[PDB]
Amino acid sequence: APDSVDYRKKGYVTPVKNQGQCGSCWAFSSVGALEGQLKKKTGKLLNLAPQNLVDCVSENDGCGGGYMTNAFQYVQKNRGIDSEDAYPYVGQEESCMYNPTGKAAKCRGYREIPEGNEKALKRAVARVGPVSVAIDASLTSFQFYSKGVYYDESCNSDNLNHAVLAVGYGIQKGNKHWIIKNSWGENWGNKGYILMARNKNNACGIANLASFPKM
Template identity: 40%
Template sequence: MTIILYQAGASEGHHYRKTGQLPDISVQNLIDCTEPYGNSGCNGGLMIPVYEYIKDNEGVGSEKSYLFEEKARECRFKRQNSVVTCTGYVEIPEGDEKALEIAVGTACPASVGIDAGRPTFQFYFDGIYDESTCSNGID
Protein backbone atom coordinates (compact mmCIF):
# COMPACT_ATOMS: atom_id res chain seq x y z
CA MET A 1 0.00 0.00 0.00
CA THR A 2 2.97 2.33 0.40
CA ILE A 3 3.31 3.12 -3.31
CA ILE A 4 -0.37 4.07 -3.48
CA LEU A 5 0.02 6.40 -0.49
CA TYR A 6 2.98 8.14 -2.11
CA GLN A 7 1.14 8.34 -5.42
CA ALA A 8 -1.80 10.06 -3.74
CA GLY A 9 0.62 12.53 -2.15
CA ALA A 10 2.33 13.31 -5.45
CA SER A 11 -1.04 13.84 -7.15
CA GLU A 12 -2.18 16.12 -4.32
CA GLY A 13 1.06 18.08 -4.55
CA HIS A 14 0.81 18.48 -8.31
CA HIS A 15 -2.80 19.67 -8.00
CA TYR A 16 -1.76 22.20 -5.34
CA ARG A 17 1.08 23.49 -7.49
CA LYS A 18 -1.33 23.96 -10.39
CA THR A 19 -4.37 25.38 -8.58
CA GLY A 20 -3.32 26.54 -5.10
CA GLN A 21 -5.85 24.11 -3.60
CA LEU A 22 -4.66 21.08 -1.64
CA PRO A 23 -7.15 18.20 -1.94
CA ASP A 24 -7.20 15.12 0.25
CA ILE A 25 -7.25 12.18 -2.18
CA SER A 26 -8.87 8.94 -1.07
CA VAL A 27 -6.23 6.25 -0.78
CA GLN A 28 -9.06 3.73 -0.36
CA ASN A 29 -10.43 4.76 -3.76
CA LEU A 30 -7.03 3.96 -5.29
CA ILE A 31 -6.69 0.67 -3.38
CA ASP A 32 -10.16 -0.51 -4.40
CA CYS A 33 -10.20 0.64 -8.00
CA THR A 34 -6.72 0.07 -9.46
CA GLU A 35 -6.68 -3.73 -9.32
CA PRO A 36 -7.89 -4.01 -12.96
CA TYR A 37 -4.87 -1.84 -13.83
CA GLY A 38 -2.44 -4.31 -12.26
CA ASN A 39 -2.31 -3.27 -8.60
CA SER A 40 -2.94 -5.63 -5.69
CA GLY A 41 -5.16 -3.72 -3.26
CA CYS A 42 -3.68 -3.67 0.23
CA ASN A 43 -0.86 -5.95 -0.94
CA GLY A 44 0.80 -3.17 -2.87
CA GLY A 45 0.72 -1.24 -6.04
CA LEU A 46 2.63 0.56 -8.71
CA MET A 47 2.58 4.16 -9.85
CA ILE A 48 1.62 3.90 -13.52
CA PRO A 49 -1.64 2.00 -12.84
CA VAL A 50 -2.71 4.75 -10.42
CA TYR A 51 -2.12 7.47 -13.03
CA GLU A 52 -3.89 5.39 -15.69
CA TYR A 53 -6.88 4.81 -13.41
CA ILE A 54 -7.22 8.52 -12.54
CA LYS A 55 -6.86 9.46 -16.21
CA ASP A 56 -9.34 6.85 -17.52
CA ASN A 57 -11.94 7.61 -14.82
CA GLU A 58 -11.55 11.39 -15.08
CA GLY A 59 -10.60 11.69 -11.46
CA VAL A 60 -10.25 10.21 -8.02
CA GLY A 61 -12.47 10.80 -5.01
CA SER A 62 -11.77 12.76 -1.87
CA GLU A 63 -10.95 11.11 1.44
CA LYS A 64 -14.21 12.51 2.80
CA SER A 65 -16.29 10.96 0.00
CA TYR A 66 -14.46 7.60 0.00
CA LEU A 67 -13.30 6.79 3.54
CA PHE A 68 -10.29 4.63 4.38
CA GLU A 69 -11.36 1.17 5.58
CA GLU A 70 -8.03 -0.66 6.08
CA LYS A 71 -8.97 -3.44 3.64
CA ALA A 72 -9.56 -3.77 -0.09
CA ARG A 73 -13.18 -3.62 -1.17
CA GLU A 74 -15.21 -3.32 -4.35
CA CYS A 75 -14.65 -0.08 -6.29
CA ARG A 76 -17.32 2.51 -5.39
CA PHE A 77 -15.92 5.64 -7.08
CA LYS A 78 -18.46 8.27 -8.12
CA ARG A 79 -17.22 10.84 -10.63
CA GLN A 80 -19.15 13.67 -8.93
CA ASN A 81 -16.84 13.23 -5.90
CA SER A 82 -13.67 13.68 -7.95
CA VAL A 83 -11.13 16.13 -6.53
CA VAL A 84 -8.13 15.53 -8.82
CA THR A 85 -7.80 14.56 -12.47
CA CYS A 86 -4.84 13.42 -14.56
CA THR A 87 -4.26 14.32 -18.19
CA GLY A 88 -0.90 12.58 -18.48
CA TYR A 89 2.34 11.60 -16.82
CA VAL A 90 5.98 11.00 -17.67
CA GLU A 91 7.87 7.86 -16.76
CA ILE A 92 11.54 8.57 -16.08
CA PRO A 93 14.04 5.85 -16.97
CA GLU A 94 15.33 3.88 -13.98
CA GLY A 95 18.52 5.34 -12.58
CA ASP A 96 18.34 8.60 -14.57
CA GLU A 97 18.96 11.07 -11.75
CA LYS A 98 19.33 14.01 -14.15
CA ALA A 99 15.90 13.35 -15.66
CA LEU A 100 14.43 13.14 -12.15
CA GLU A 101 16.09 16.44 -11.22
CA ILE A 102 14.66 18.13 -14.30
CA ALA A 103 11.17 16.69 -13.72
CA VAL A 104 11.02 17.78 -10.09
CA GLY A 105 12.49 21.20 -10.87
CA THR A 106 10.24 22.02 -13.80
CA ALA A 107 7.16 19.87 -13.88
CA CYS A 108 5.80 18.46 -10.67
CA PRO A 109 6.27 16.38 -7.56
CA ALA A 110 7.45 12.87 -8.38
CA SER A 111 6.59 9.40 -7.21
CA VAL A 112 9.65 7.23 -6.80
CA GLY A 113 9.57 3.46 -6.45
CA ILE A 114 12.21 1.59 -4.50
CA ASP A 115 12.93 -2.07 -3.85
CA ALA A 116 11.46 -2.57 -0.39
CA GLY A 117 11.65 -6.35 -0.47
CA ARG A 118 14.79 -6.77 1.62
CA PRO A 119 14.25 -7.60 5.31
CA THR A 120 16.81 -4.94 6.26
CA PHE A 121 14.57 -2.34 4.62
CA GLN A 122 11.32 -3.75 5.99
CA PHE A 123 12.63 -3.53 9.56
CA TYR A 124 14.56 -0.27 9.12
CA PHE A 125 13.62 2.32 11.72
CA ASP A 126 16.28 5.02 12.09
CA GLY A 127 19.27 6.71 10.47
CA ILE A 128 20.54 6.47 6.91
CA TYR A 129 19.55 3.19 5.29
CA ASP A 130 22.55 1.42 3.77
CA GLU A 131 22.30 -2.06 2.29
CA SER A 132 25.65 -3.32 0.99
CA THR A 133 24.04 -5.92 -1.28
CA CYS A 134 21.53 -3.48 -2.75
CA SER A 135 21.97 -2.50 -6.38
CA ASN A 136 20.81 0.79 -7.82
CA GLY A 137 20.43 -0.80 -11.24
CA ILE A 138 23.14 1.37 -12.76
CA ASP A 139 26.15 -0.41 -14.23
Protein backbone atom coordinates in the same frame (compact mmCIF):
# COMPACT_ATOMS: atom_id res chain seq x y z
CA ALA B 1 17.78 22.58 -11.50
CA PRO B 2 18.45 24.08 -8.05
CA ASP B 3 21.05 22.50 -5.76
CA SER B 4 18.23 21.68 -3.35
CA VAL B 5 14.43 21.44 -3.38
CA ASP B 6 11.95 20.62 -0.62
CA TYR B 7 8.29 20.67 -1.58
CA ARG B 8 7.22 20.48 2.07
CA LYS B 9 8.46 24.10 2.31
CA LYS B 10 6.08 25.11 -0.52
CA GLY B 11 3.07 23.42 1.07
CA TYR B 12 2.82 20.79 -1.68
CA VAL B 13 2.86 17.78 0.67
CA THR B 14 0.09 16.38 2.87
CA PRO B 15 0.78 14.75 6.24
CA VAL B 16 2.39 11.34 6.43
CA LYS B 17 -0.12 8.48 6.25
CA ASN B 18 -0.01 4.90 7.49
CA GLN B 19 -0.99 2.21 4.99
CA GLY B 20 -1.30 -0.37 7.75
CA GLN B 21 -1.22 -4.06 6.84
CA CYS B 22 -2.58 -3.48 3.34
CA GLY B 23 -0.02 -3.59 0.49
CA SER B 24 -1.15 -0.19 -0.80
CA CYS B 25 2.18 1.64 -0.88
CA TRP B 26 1.61 2.24 -4.59
CA ALA B 27 -1.71 3.98 -3.85
CA PHE B 28 -0.12 6.26 -1.26
CA SER B 29 2.75 7.09 -3.60
CA SER B 30 0.27 7.81 -6.39
CA VAL B 31 -1.96 10.08 -4.33
CA GLY B 32 1.10 11.92 -3.03
CA ALA B 33 2.19 12.75 -6.57
CA LEU B 34 -1.37 13.74 -7.52
CA GLU B 35 -1.64 15.91 -4.37
CA GLY B 36 1.51 17.80 -5.34
CA GLN B 37 0.20 18.51 -8.82
CA LEU B 38 -3.24 19.51 -7.51
CA LYS B 39 -1.65 22.03 -5.15
CA LYS B 40 0.60 23.40 -7.89
CA LYS B 41 -2.28 23.84 -10.36
CA THR B 42 -5.18 24.90 -8.16
CA GLY B 43 -3.65 26.13 -4.91
CA LYS B 44 -5.47 23.45 -2.93
CA LEU B 45 -3.66 21.03 -0.61
CA LEU B 46 -5.88 18.10 0.31
CA ASN B 47 -5.73 14.41 1.05
CA LEU B 48 -6.67 12.40 -2.03
CA ALA B 49 -8.15 8.89 -1.64
CA PRO B 50 -5.76 5.94 -1.81
CA GLN B 51 -8.81 3.71 -1.16
CA ASN B 52 -10.28 4.86 -4.49
CA LEU B 53 -7.17 3.48 -6.18
CA VAL B 54 -7.00 0.25 -4.15
CA ASP B 55 -10.62 -0.61 -4.99
CA CYS B 56 -10.91 0.65 -8.56
CA VAL B 57 -7.60 0.14 -10.39
CA SER B 58 -8.32 -3.24 -11.98
CA GLU B 59 -4.78 -3.64 -13.36
CA ASN B 60 -3.40 -3.45 -9.84
CA ASP B 61 -3.87 -6.02 -7.06
CA GLY B 62 -5.46 -3.98 -4.26
CA CYS B 63 -3.72 -4.86 -1.01
CA GLY B 64 -1.58 -7.32 -2.98
CA GLY B 65 0.37 -4.47 -4.56
CA GLY B 66 0.41 -2.42 -7.73
CA TYR B 67 2.05 0.12 -10.04
CA MET B 68 1.72 3.91 -9.77
CA THR B 69 1.46 4.28 -13.55
CA ASN B 70 -1.65 2.06 -13.52
CA ALA B 71 -3.14 4.36 -10.90
CA PHE B 72 -2.43 7.50 -12.96
CA GLN B 73 -3.88 5.83 -16.05
CA TYR B 74 -7.00 4.93 -14.07
CA VAL B 75 -7.53 8.47 -12.80
CA GLN B 76 -7.21 9.77 -16.37
CA LYS B 77 -9.60 7.20 -17.86
CA ASN B 78 -12.01 7.56 -14.92
CA ARG B 79 -12.00 11.36 -15.36
CA GLY B 80 -11.25 11.81 -11.66
CA ILE B 81 -10.15 10.68 -8.23
CA ASP B 82 -12.09 11.25 -5.00
CA SER B 83 -10.86 13.07 -1.92
CA GLU B 84 -9.90 11.05 1.16
CA ASP B 85 -12.83 12.67 2.95
CA ALA B 86 -15.28 11.40 0.30
CA TYR B 87 -13.77 7.91 -0.05
CA PRO B 88 -11.95 7.11 3.22
CA TYR B 89 -9.10 4.63 3.64
CA VAL B 90 -10.20 1.49 5.48
CA GLY B 91 -7.01 -0.56 5.15
CA GLN B 92 -8.42 -3.39 3.04
CA GLU B 93 -9.85 -3.67 -0.47
CA GLU B 94 -13.53 -2.83 -0.90
CA SER B 95 -15.82 -2.90 -3.91
CA CYS B 96 -15.23 0.14 -6.13
CA MET B 97 -17.16 3.00 -4.54
CA TYR B 98 -16.02 5.88 -6.78
CA ASN B 99 -18.44 8.81 -6.84
CA PRO B 100 -17.98 11.70 -9.26
CA THR B 101 -19.59 14.07 -6.72
CA GLY B 102 -16.54 13.66 -4.48
CA LYS B 103 -14.06 14.30 -7.30
CA ALA B 104 -11.08 16.37 -6.12
CA ALA B 105 -8.46 15.91 -8.84
CA LYS B 106 -8.01 14.84 -12.45
CA CYS B 107 -5.15 13.32 -14.42
CA ARG B 108 -4.16 13.94 -18.04
CA GLY B 109 -1.66 11.11 -18.29
CA TYR B 110 1.74 10.37 -16.85
CA ARG B 111 5.46 10.42 -17.56
CA GLU B 112 8.25 7.99 -16.73
CA ILE B 113 11.76 9.01 -15.73
CA PRO B 114 14.37 7.34 -17.98
CA GLU B 115 15.38 4.18 -16.11
CA GLY B 116 18.37 4.54 -13.81
CA ASN B 117 18.86 8.25 -14.49
CA GLU B 118 19.15 10.17 -11.22
CA LYS B 119 19.94 13.42 -13.03
CA ALA B 120 16.65 13.10 -14.91
CA LEU B 121 14.90 12.29 -11.64
CA LYS B 122 16.40 15.45 -10.10
CA ARG B 123 15.27 17.51 -13.09
CA ALA B 124 11.78 16.03 -12.81
CA VAL B 125 11.52 16.77 -9.10
CA ALA B 126 12.74 20.35 -9.72
CA ARG B 127 10.40 21.09 -12.65
CA VAL B 128 7.28 19.13 -11.78
CA GLY B 129 6.88 18.51 -8.08
CA PRO B 130 6.92 15.35 -5.94
CA VAL B 131 7.66 12.25 -8.04
CA SER B 132 6.52 8.65 -7.36
CA VAL B 133 9.48 6.30 -6.96
CA ALA B 134 10.08 2.60 -6.33
CA ILE B 135 12.80 1.25 -4.05
CA ASP B 136 14.07 -1.86 -2.32
CA ALA B 137 12.79 -1.16 1.20
CA SER B 138 13.21 -4.73 2.45
CA LEU B 139 16.35 -4.27 4.57
CA THR B 140 16.38 -3.98 8.36
CA SER B 141 18.58 -0.91 7.92
CA PHE B 142 15.66 0.79 6.15
CA GLN B 143 13.21 -0.33 8.84
CA PHE B 144 15.46 1.14 11.54
CA TYR B 145 16.34 4.39 9.76
CA SER B 146 16.49 7.40 12.08
CA LYS B 147 18.93 10.08 10.88
CA GLY B 148 21.53 10.96 8.27
CA VAL B 149 21.61 9.91 4.65
CA TYR B 150 20.56 6.29 4.18
CA TYR B 151 22.85 3.95 2.29
CA ASP B 152 23.16 0.17 2.45
CA GLU B 153 25.42 -1.70 0.01
CA SER B 154 23.01 -4.66 0.19
CA CYS B 155 20.16 -2.67 -1.32
CA ASN B 156 19.17 -4.47 -4.51
CA SER B 157 17.60 -2.66 -7.50
CA ASP B 158 16.31 -5.99 -8.85
CA ASN B 159 14.18 -6.15 -5.72
CA LEU B 160 11.97 -3.10 -6.17
CA ASN B 161 9.26 -3.81 -3.63
CA HIS B 162 8.01 -0.55 -2.16
CA ALA B 163 6.55 2.70 -3.50
CA VAL B 164 7.33 6.05 -1.89
CA LEU B 165 7.36 9.75 -2.85
CA ALA B 166 10.37 11.90 -3.68
CA VAL B 167 9.42 15.37 -2.37
CA GLY B 168 12.81 16.96 -2.79
CA TYR B 169 16.55 16.54 -2.74
CA GLY B 170 19.62 18.24 -1.39
CA ILE B 171 22.76 17.68 0.57
CA GLN B 172 23.52 17.02 4.21
CA LYS B 173 27.08 17.40 5.48
CA GLY B 174 28.44 16.69 2.01
CA ASN B 175 26.13 13.73 1.46
CA LYS B 176 23.69 14.17 -1.44
CA HIS B 177 20.21 12.84 -0.82
CA TRP B 178 16.62 12.45 -1.93
CA ILE B 179 13.91 13.55 0.49
CA ILE B 180 11.49 10.64 0.67
CA LYS B 181 7.97 10.55 2.10
CA ASN B 182 6.94 7.06 3.23
CA SER B 183 3.50 5.70 4.21
CA TRP B 184 4.46 3.79 7.36
CA GLY B 185 3.15 6.43 9.77
CA GLU B 186 4.96 9.23 11.57
CA ASN B 187 6.67 6.97 14.10
CA TRP B 188 8.80 5.43 11.38
CA GLY B 189 12.02 7.10 10.25
CA ASN B 190 12.24 10.83 10.82
CA LYS B 191 8.56 11.71 11.32
CA GLY B 192 7.71 9.40 8.43
CA TYR B 193 10.53 10.56 6.17
CA ILE B 194 13.91 9.25 5.07
CA LEU B 195 16.89 10.89 3.37
CA MET B 196 18.17 8.39 0.81
CA ALA B 197 21.58 8.55 -0.89
CA ARG B 198 21.55 10.42 -4.20
CA ASN B 199 24.13 10.09 -7.00
CA LYS B 200 25.48 7.00 -5.30
CA ASN B 201 25.07 4.61 -8.21
CA ASN B 202 21.28 4.63 -8.08
CA ALA B 203 21.11 3.38 -4.48
CA CYS B 204 18.16 1.04 -3.81
CA GLY B 205 17.04 1.44 -7.44
CA ILE B 206 15.47 4.80 -6.68
CA ALA B 207 15.57 5.98 -10.32
CA ASN B 208 14.47 2.65 -11.84
CA LEU B 209 10.69 3.05 -11.78
CA ALA B 210 9.92 6.71 -11.18
CA SER B 211 6.89 8.49 -12.61
CA PHE B 212 4.66 11.53 -12.22
CA PRO B 213 1.10 12.40 -13.29
CA LYS B 214 0.13 15.09 -15.77
CA MET B 215 -2.58 17.53 -14.75
